[PDB]
């Protein structure tokens, strides 16, 4: 069944599961042609496949060459996503394979179910949650590896850095979703908040700054304020 507020804690139990977000697989810039028509130019994209218990992000970079000579690219992108997720599952040892894959967009259900027919015991589930994983390309280091890729590539990231040494998975996912929601609502403000204190550096192998517990509380408050601020700017409240 669908994952929602009511069964949210299931994300942090000991059954291996992956979220799959396809928002950033097929990405384009729209531009005018010399004749005054409109055309698109693809740019590199990525599949965002995340284990919410452990922070493991299997970031499959989608290089623009995969679209060459293909038609109906927005449809193909869902199938290519499902093809790559299926390939990842097959590449993992049996004891690492997920028991459930949760897709962030319902249009991924049939493509993924069809690609996973060999795995009848892996549940393919939608969600009622509005998750902000499209903003993954606002994390500078992730955007950089995607944009520099010259061929298809899988890049591995822990999206929680070392937070799980100090906090639980539930708290780590909440922090991640707050940060991504903030970056989605006002990317400039959010990045200003995260980088207002340059003394707090991002480790070479990390994605986010090395905040202390107390600093994370302040940061999280500043992100909540940003989200409420933008909500008032949008709705004139």
């Amino acid at each position: 069944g669908a994952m929602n507020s009511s069964n949210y804690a299931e994300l942090f139990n000991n059954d291996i599961k992956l979220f799959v977000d396809d928002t950033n697989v097929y990405r384009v810039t729209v531009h005018k042609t010399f004749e005054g028509n409109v055309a698109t130019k693809a740019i590199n994209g990525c599949i965002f496949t995340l284990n919410p218990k452990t922070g493991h992000l299997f970031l499959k970079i989608i290089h623009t060459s995969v679209w060459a000579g293909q038609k109906r690219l927005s449809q193909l992108a869902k199938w290519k996503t499902a093809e790559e997720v299926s390939a990842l599952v097959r590449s993992l040892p049996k004891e690492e394979q997920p028991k459930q894959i949760i897709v962030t967009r319902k249009a991924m259900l049939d493509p993924l179910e069809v690609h996973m027919l060999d795995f009848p015991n892996i549940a393919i589930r939608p969600t009622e949650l509005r998750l902000p994983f499209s903003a993954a390309m606002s994390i500078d280091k992730l955007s950089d590896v995607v944009m520099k890729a010259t061929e298809p590539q899988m890049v591995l990231f822990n999206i929680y850095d070392d937070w799980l040494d100090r906090i639980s998975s539930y708290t780590a996912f909440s922090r991640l979703t707050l940060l991504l929601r903030a970056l989605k609502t006002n990317e400039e403000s959010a990045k200003m908040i995260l980088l207002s204190d340059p003394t707090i550096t991002i480790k070479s192998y990390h994605l986010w700054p090395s905040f202390t517990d107390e600093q994370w509380i302040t940061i999280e408050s500043q992100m909540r304020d940003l989200i409420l601020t933008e909500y008032g700017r949008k709705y004139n409240v």
């Binding site: 193909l76 199938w79 499902a82 093809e83 049939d110 493509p111 179910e113 069809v114 690609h115 027919l117 060999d118």
Partner: protein, 300 residues
């Protein structure tokens, strides 16, 4: 012309014989149906007046034996039987005919409805869907489930229609996932037609039988099968022209015959709107699209 004689009519019942229905009163001088056209399968069906939940019937072909209906007061239904003694049976039928104790199959000469609904239906194939090998006729009722329904509970009493499942390894070649899911031609032409059914006549025969079972008994499993077999064709980009033209004729006569008051339950909105307006064959079913739009424009 052939005859299905009856013991009597001890309980009040609506009797169907193909697309006709008539009422018989409790203990009325009713001994059967004569003038049944040779060359087609037929169905004789029943709805008891005192229990509308009792809807059952028998598919038969009079070329395969002499059949009679006898009420069984223990099992509470009209049963079809076979009389092996031809002489005795011909004499029994002659006596009833002389006494004008039989109704006459009311086929209009201009009318090809029954042929058109049963063109590809063969008793031998019916007997593989409905397995009861000791009889030459086949019992079907409202409640009998299909093999596919049972997979998702008595096997000997099931409708063994060919299982069609669009999200199954049978339907989807490894490495052609998107291709095979969006264009079902492989599954229609190689898996089903070449592999299982052998030819389109057998495919259409099962499609026609499923429709008739759904329409005569309110058999949900048959309704599911009829629509699945339509959708498999309509969702294939590559279908022989003769099959498309025949499918249009098949469906036209099915839609024409359907009781108007049962359209809401017998026609799946999704399948029909998909098939007539979105599918690869949306422009290949002219006669069917015309009758649907003029008879059931609401559903669309």
């Amino acid at each position: 012309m052939n005859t299905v004689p009856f013991t009597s009519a001890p309980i009040e019942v609506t009797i169907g014989i193909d697309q006709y229905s008539f009422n018989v009163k409790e203990n009325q001088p009713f001994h059967g149906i004569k003038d049944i056209p040779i060359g087609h399968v037929h169905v004789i069906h029943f709805q008891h007046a005192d229990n509308s939940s009792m809807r059952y019937g028998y598919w038969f072909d009079c070329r395969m034996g002499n059949f009679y209906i006898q009420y069984d007061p223990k099992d509470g239904l009209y049963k079809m039987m076979e009389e092996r003694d031809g002489a005795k049976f011909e004499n029994i039928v002659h006596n009833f005919k002389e006494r004008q104790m039989m109704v006459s199959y009311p086929k209009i000469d201009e009318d090809d409805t029954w042929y058109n609904l049963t063109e590809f239906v063969q008793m031998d194939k019916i007997r593989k869907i409905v397995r009861k090998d000791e009889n030459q006729f086949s019992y079907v009722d409202s409640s009998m489930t299909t093999v596919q329904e049972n997979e998702l509970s008595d096997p000997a009493h099931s409708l063994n229609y060919t299982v069609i499942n669009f999200k199954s390894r049978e339907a989807i070649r490894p490495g052609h996932e998107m291709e095979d899911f969006l264009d079902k031609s492989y599954y229609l032409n190689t898996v089903m037609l070449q592999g299982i059914f052998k030819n389109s006549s057998n495919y259409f025969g099962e499609l026609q039988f499923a429709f008739l079972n759904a329409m005569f008994f309110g058999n949900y499993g048959s309704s599911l099968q009829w629509h699945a077999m339509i959708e498999l064709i309509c969702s294939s980009a590559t279908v022989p022209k003769h099959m498309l033209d025949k499918l249009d004729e098949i469906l036209y006569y099915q839609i024409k015959t359907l009781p108007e008051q049962y359209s809401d339950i017998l026609l799946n909105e999704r399948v029909w709107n998909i098939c007539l307006y979105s599918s690869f064959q949306k422009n290949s079913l002219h006669n069917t699209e015309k009758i649907m739009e003029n008879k059931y424009p609401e559903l669309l």
